[PDB]
Design a protein around this ligand. Structure first.
Ligand code: 3PE
Ligand code: 3PE
Ligand code: SF4
Ligand code: SF4
Ligand code: SF4
Lengths: 317, 269, 94, 53, 112, 152, 176
């Protein structure tokens, strides 16, 4: 019954991306002083099952001046790596016990930009031709802001597995000994996964130009779908790394209860940022990576090399 | 789409990344206006000045009625002048709500649009109670105001206008000491020379950059000399310090309203 | 300790208004679930409630019932069904 | 407002902004980015139908 | 032997929903105007993709900063070791060797 | 049968559960639509989210005033919309053109370009007689695609 | 007179630079700024629940048209041709005839509801106080062939209520 476990993980998470689109706007609504989806629910709660069927009735045109084998291959690789990344992730037991899987996250988070380079090219001209070339350019630069300060906690964890990442945090909630790194951990995933303040990707992006600009609601229904699957997955990855919960072997039930409550709270912030701050005007977006983000990340890197040595506090492996 | 919601087609031969050449095209809404007023009378062709802006309602028809009273040799009566100021300085809390919100929606801030229009609907109420209608009111005539305002509006402007300075105390904390919006707007579009007067500019994108002058206290309109207020100026010559006129004029328009409730003589209209 | 300090008011508000059937029957049309304070008299069975003067704009809410002059059961409400006397009242015009 | 002397007027030429405020964008825009250009236009408070001057 | 049947499920469920959403109502019986109106708001656009220098240097610069994090990658494995004065003083070298490559290029970036 | 005509109690309910309007804000009836997206008579979350892109929209809402120099740019945008498309014209200038019905530079009516479903009259209709306009559009959806393939 | 805004130099000493270098680096703005001003969600939302609740209006409101009539009926119109001479948009189209009794009346009366620009110039030009902009925005028909009004629509539309209209005009004729 291994095969019944995989389907027990793909299917209960497509609701949690469909029941996030509804909480996308109720939370964003009470900031504007207005109620949620009022009339169809009764409380809203039945909105996405009606808002899903309309997309698969509405005619999925292909553009006449488009290519063929590239345009319908990027949504295959969209949902592939958006759902494959959920595998090696402990809660409290992962589906797969990888020896080194923290690196496998970057082995999965690297290839997502190789679909945007397809879809911007595969269909058509200037509103996604050059306008998607400068969306690959922002997402490549925020790995070296990411991969360094992901390594900067592993000097304190001890190894590459994720079971040690819960063992080392039984008494600490490790956001305290590394709180400068925890800041730039947030803004990276806030800009890499193509969200609201650093937003030259989706729809705020000259407010007209996106990679969604050409997909009718047949193939478009996944792009949005798949994408919303990253944003609840960097949140499930931050809260297993910094803000780690407590594991008890005799009681694994109380792990997940105290766990899903925490990833939901960080997921609120991606909604709660969008209702405050304006955009970044593509220069100043990348003007603060090199000049401003990056030299501090090397500074704390040299700090986290020497401090396990000159404390005589080497982590065991 | 909405760079002004579907108008203004412009061509840009952009020099690599910079623009260096920009030449727009108007005429997508032309309608034949000035041809068509020749075939009407004076009173009958008045509601095509109200539709000549969008959002100024009583500020237009203030400059048509005043341009026909001159030709007639007639002044308006004294109560008809303290009505026009109570409206002509309440549309300056509508044209400045829009210029500080839809600007900051094109940039991308969501809420101060919604945070102000929820409050703005307390003020399209006030047109309906006096004229009869929602936006375009045919109210001002070339002989003063049409008809008298009902029993009320002085316990309802006063409840409103005593509580507007907190709502304008929210945008100061949204925008002014904000860093990202200051970064989006400093030293951008600095046209400040006497080519910024050779082009024949009117106010702000003048006085917000240098030259102190406006036609409200160097010429008269009305009984409008009998109020006291100051005219905000800008220091440097960019957008962030012609932004700050529009935030600061809205505080000074509350002063000209509170000075107008005390002074209205009873009489004719 | 506000979890029971103010739910005690809402316990009689939610539950004891029409029992088990009279609560969810108004819930399936909208989230308009608050029982109003006063009543109207007119006309058919549509008691246009008027609230406890604790609102403005949402203080004069009406209810529709069934089939004015050839309509469906409850799933067609267009809003133009009102008598031409409540236009003087529903719109707060006097 | 040229008036001839009877009930229907002669020419009525309107002066409004947008002729000054937008002829002076081509000077104002050169040197900056493209995403600076949408930042420029909002401060003039352009309302169309008033470019019908 | 499930790793490898841990993903071929996930891709055959992925390619399932594509052809059912796209290709199945692509055989429907509507009028389906095939006229060249399918491109939006950039009608003709009779030009080739022009070169942009400031968007090439962003590609190469990343690539040379990407290499020596893989040298920097086995630092946690370089902890449980022998002689460690060597291990510390060599680990500090590469970061400075990455840092100087900033400061030379930092005197000329351009509008990136 | 009872099997097939029951299925259009879902598809003709799914098609009226979430409309995605394009709008053409051109003239004064743009602003009196924006107050409906303002949270007093809040347009969104009574079923119908506000504006999207031309490739994704169901039901467009013409407003303002259609001159000669906007007449081809309307019809081009109407083509890209999908098959279950609907057209609502608000404003008294997309009904026969307000005034400027007699001046040279106005397309006299906006039905002469596209087929339009629900006419809403009034210089600016008060965003109150526009929710009543769209609640007439949802009542229009009582059609069925069943009993078409099942009759003929 | 004057007022100068954004005309002030920084202090530029040893103390207040740390006050500004705590801002840029550790974000004493941007959380105290807008992590608190936004939430502030705890107010009651103000949404008119539209099919049941409706919004406020005023007794001089403009809307659908009507033609009143006297106590026991006379069709208050007298075809005096003024409501058609000051429509700015030339909507009204009147064609009278001497009716057989001797008093003159209309035969055809036509108001477009599309050229109607909603002045209130018909409402106030009438001497015999007949044609009244009635207070009901109920509209939204589906055909352009329909919004053209005849005479015998307006009377039906003007006798669906007069309890509505005559409560309005009695309140408001004292000003005009
Ligand atoms: C459009 C449809 C057509 C395309 C359909 C096919 C698409 C497939 C794309 C999937 C790409 C995923 C590739 C990821 C490779 C990384 C796998 C991995 O590293 O697993 C970790 C583990 C490492 O070993 P270890 O951790 O030490 O095990 C514990 C021992 N105590 O390793 C293991 O546990 C076992 C290692 C051997 C398992 C078999 C080999 C794995 C790769 C098989 C697929 C080959 C890749 C196909 C090409 C990829 C194209 C993107
Ligand atoms: C000797 C002992 C050892 C000493 C150890 C001392 C530890 C010190 C730790 C300091 C390092 C951590 C701080 C990280 C640096 C902050 C990043 C930065 O430098 O931003 C600079 C940015 C540039 O703009 P600026 O310089 O201000 O110029 C414009 C002024 N007109 O200006 C900015 O402020 C930009 C602000 C961020 C931009 C994105 C904002 C979008 C919203 C993000 C909200 C995120 C909220 C928090 C994230 C979640 C936290 C859990
Ligand atoms: S006539 Fe009506 S639609 Fe046209 S601009 Fe005026 S208010 Fe807007
Ligand atoms: S209402 Fe007055 S103006 Fe109109 S037709 Fe009758 S008498 Fe003439
Ligand atoms: S409201 Fe004005 S334009 Fe319309 S019919 Fe009456 S007078 Fe004519």
């Amino acid at each position: 019954m291994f095969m019944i476990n995989i389907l027990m993980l793909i299917i209960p998470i497509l609701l949690a991306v469909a029941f996030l689109t509804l909480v996308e706007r109720k939370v964003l609504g009470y900031m504007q002083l207005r109620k949620g989806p009022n009339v169809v629910g009764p409380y809203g709660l039945l909105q996405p099952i009606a808002d899903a069927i309309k997309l698969f009735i509405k005619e999925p045109l292909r553009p006449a001046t488009s290519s063929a084998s590239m345009f319908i291959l990027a949504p295959i690789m969209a949902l592939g790596l958006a759902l494959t990344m959920w595998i090696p992730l402990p809660m409290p037991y992962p589906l797969i016990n990888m020896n080194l899987g923290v690196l496998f996250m970057l082995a999965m988070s690297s290839l997502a930009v190789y679909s945007i380079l397809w879809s911007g090219w595969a269909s058509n001209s200037k509103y996604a031709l050059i306008g998607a070339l400068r969306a690959v350019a922002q997402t490549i630069s925020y790995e070296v802001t990411l991969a360094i300060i992901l390594l900067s906690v592993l000097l304190m964890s001890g190894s590459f597995t994720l079971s040690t990442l819960i063992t080392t945090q039984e008494q600490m909630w490790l956001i305290l000994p590394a709180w400068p790194l925890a800041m730039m951990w947030f803004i990276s995933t806030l800009a890499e996964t193509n969200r609201a303040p650093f937003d030259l990707t989706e729809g705020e992006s000259e407010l007209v130009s996106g990679f969604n600009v050409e997909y009718a609601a047949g193939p478009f229904a996944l792009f949005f779908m798949a994408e919303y699957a990253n944003i609840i997955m960097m949140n499930i990855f931050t809260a297993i790394l910094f803000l780690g919960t407590s594991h008890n072997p005799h009681m694994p039930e109380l792990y997940t209860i105290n766990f899903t409550i925490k990833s939901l709270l960080l997921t609120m912030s991606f909604l709660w940022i969008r209702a405050s701050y304006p955009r970044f005007r593509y220069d100043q977006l990348m003007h603060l990576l090199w000049k401003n983000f990056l030299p501090l990340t090397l500074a704390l890197c040299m700090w986290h090399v020497s401090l396990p040595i000159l404390t005589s506090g080497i982590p065991p492996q | 789409h909405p760079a002004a919601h579907g108008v203004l087609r412009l061509v840009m031969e952009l020099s690599g990344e910079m623009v260096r050449k920009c030449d727009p095209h108007i005429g997508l809404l032309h309608r034949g206006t000035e041809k068509l007023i020749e075939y009407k009378t004076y009173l009958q062709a008045l509601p095509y000045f109200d539709r000549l802006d969008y959002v100024s309602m009583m500020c237009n028809e203030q400059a048509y009625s005043l341009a026909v009273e001159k030709l007639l040799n007639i002044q308006p009566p004294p109560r008809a002048q303290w009505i026009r100021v109570l409206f002509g300085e309440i549309t300056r809390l509508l044209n400045h709500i829009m210029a500080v919100t839809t600007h900051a929606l094109d940039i991308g801030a969501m809420t101060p649009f919604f945070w102000m229009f929820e409050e703005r609907e307390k003020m399209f109420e006030f047109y309906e109670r006096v004229s009869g209608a929602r936006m375009h009111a045919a109210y001002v005539r070339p002989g003063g105001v049409h008809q008298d305002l009902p029993l009320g509006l002085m316990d309802d402007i006063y409840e409103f206008s005593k509580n507007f300075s907190l709502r304008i105390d929210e945008l100061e904390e949204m925008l002014t000491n904000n860093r990202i919006w200051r970064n989006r707007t400093v030293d951008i579009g600095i046209v400040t020379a006497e080519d910024a007067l050779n082009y024949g500019f009117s106010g702000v994108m003048l006085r917000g950059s240098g030259i102190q002058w406006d036609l409200r206290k160097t010429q008269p309109y009305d009984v409008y000399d009998q109020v006291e207020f100051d005219v905000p100026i800008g220091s440097r010559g960019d957008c962030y310090d012609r932004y700050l006129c529009r935030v600061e004029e809205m505080r000074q328009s509350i002063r000209i309203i509170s000075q107008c409730l005390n002074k209205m003589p009873p009489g004719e209209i | 300790m506000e979890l029971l300090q103010v739910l005690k008011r809402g316990l009689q508000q939610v539950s004891g208004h029409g029992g088990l059937r009279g609560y969810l029957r108004v819930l399936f049309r909208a989230n308009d679930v608050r029982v109003g304070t006063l009543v109207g008299e007119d006309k058919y069975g549509n008691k246009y409630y008027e609230d406890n003067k604790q609102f403005f704009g949402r203080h004069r809410w009406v209810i529709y019932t069934t089939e004015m002059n050839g309509k469906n059961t409850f799933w067609d409400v267009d809003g133009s069904m009102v008598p031409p006397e409540w236009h003087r009242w529903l719109h707060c015009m006097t | 407002l040229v008036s001839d002397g009877s009930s229907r007027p002669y020419r009525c030429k309107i002066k409004a902004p947008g002729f000054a405020h937008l002829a002076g964008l081509d000077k104002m825009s050169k040197g900056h980015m493209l995403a600076d250009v949408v930042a420029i236009i909002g401060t003039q408070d352009i309302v169309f139908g008033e470019v019908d001057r | 032997m499930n790793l490898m049947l841990a993903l071929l499920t996930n891709f055959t469920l992925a390619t399932l929903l594509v052809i059912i959403a796209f290709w199945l109502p692509q055989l429907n019986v509507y009028s389906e105007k095939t006229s060249p109106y399918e491109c939006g708001f950039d009608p003709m656009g009779s030009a080739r993709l022009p070169f942009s220098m400031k968007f090439f240097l962003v590609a190469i610069t990343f690539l040379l900063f990407d290499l020596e994090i893989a040298l920097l990658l086995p630092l946690p494995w370089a902890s449980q070791t022998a002689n460690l004065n060597t291990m510390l003083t060599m680990a500090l070298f590469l970061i400075i060797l990455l840092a100087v490559s900033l400061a030379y290029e930092w005197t000329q970036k351009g509008l990136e | 049968e009872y099997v097939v005509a029951k299925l259009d109690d879902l598809i003709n309910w799914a098609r009226r559960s979430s409309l995605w309007p394009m709008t053409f804000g051109l003239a004064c009836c743009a602003v009196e639509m924006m107050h409906m997206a303002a949270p007093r008579y809040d347009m969104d979350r009574f079923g119908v989210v506000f504006r999207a892109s031309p490739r994704q929209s169901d039901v467009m809402i013409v407003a303002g005033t259609l001159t000669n120099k906007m007449a081809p740019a309307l019809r081009k945008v109407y083509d890209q919309m999908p098959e279950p498309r609907y057209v609502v014209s608000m404003g008294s200038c997309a009904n026969g053109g307000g005034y400027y019905h007699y001046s040279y530079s106005v397309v006299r009516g906006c039905d002469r370009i596209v087929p339009v479903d629900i006419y809403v009259p009034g210089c600016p209709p008060t965003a109150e007689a526009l929710l009543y306009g769209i609640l007439q559009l949802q009542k229009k959806i009582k059609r069925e695609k069943r009993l078409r393939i099942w009759y003929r | 007179t004057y007022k100068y805004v954004n005309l002030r130099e920084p202090s530029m000493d040893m103390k207040s630079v740390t006050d500004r270098a705590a801002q840029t680096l550790l974000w004493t703005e941007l959380i105290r700024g807008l992590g608190m001003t936004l939430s502030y969600l705890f107010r009651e939302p103000a949404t008119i629940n539209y099919p049941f609740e409706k919004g406020p209006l005023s007794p001089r409101f403009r809307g659908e048209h009507a033609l009143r009539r006297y106590p026991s009926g006379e069709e208050r119109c007298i075809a005096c041709k003024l409501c058609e001479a000051v429509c700015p948009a030339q909507a009204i189209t009147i064609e009278a005839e001497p009716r057989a009794d001797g008093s003159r009346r209309t035969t055809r009366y036509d108001i477009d509801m599309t050229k109607c620009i909603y002045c209130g110039f018909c409402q106030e030009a009438c001497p015999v106080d007949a044609i009244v902009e009635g207070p009901n925005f109920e509209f939204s028909t589906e055909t352009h062939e329909e919004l053209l009004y005849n005479k015998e629509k307006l009377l039906n539309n003007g006798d669906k209520w007069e309890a509505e209209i005559a409560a309005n005009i009695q309140a408001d004729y004292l000003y005009r």
